[PDB]
Amino acid sequence: SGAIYVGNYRVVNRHLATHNDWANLVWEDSSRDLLVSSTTAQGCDTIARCDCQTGVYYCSSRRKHYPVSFSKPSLIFVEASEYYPARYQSHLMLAVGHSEPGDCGGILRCQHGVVGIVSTGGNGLVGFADVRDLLWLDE
Ligand SMILES: CSc1ccccc1OC(=O)N1CCC[C@H](C(N)=O)C1
C-alpha cells in the first residue's frame, strides 16, 4: 500500500484504488497501473523532474529503504494477475531489489523528489510506475 500526496492530488496504484478514489477521479491509465484522485487537504510531497536512474525506495515487506539502479521508463510485459490480464505495462522502470505484492505503493525517490511508486516485481526484481512525466501534478 502507499500513495503520493502532491497539491490537491493523491496518486495510487490503479489496482489498489478505493471507492473514494474512483468517486473523486481526476485521471487513470490501466496501461500504467496509475490512478489520480482529488483531495481537500494540501499534500506533503514534491515530484522529481529529472532523468535520474538511481534512487531509494521503501519496501514495506522489510520495513526498510533500499538503494536501486533502475531502467528508463519503458513498455514491459507483465504476466496476468487477479487485477489484470497478461499485457504490456507502459512507463515502467525495473530494478534489482526485494518486493512482494503488498509492497505496491512504496515511494521511489531521488535527490530531486518523488520519481514513482512500486507497481510490479518478482524473483529479486522490483518495478516502479514513473510519475515524472505528469507535469500537471504540480502545474
Ligand atoms: C511488488 S508487486 C509483485 C512483487 C513480487 C511478485 C509479484 C508481484 O506482483 C506483481 O508484479 N503484480 C501484481 C499486482 C499488479 C501488478 C501490475 N502492475 O500489473 C503485477
Ligand SMILES: [Zn+2]
Ligand atoms: Zn532526480
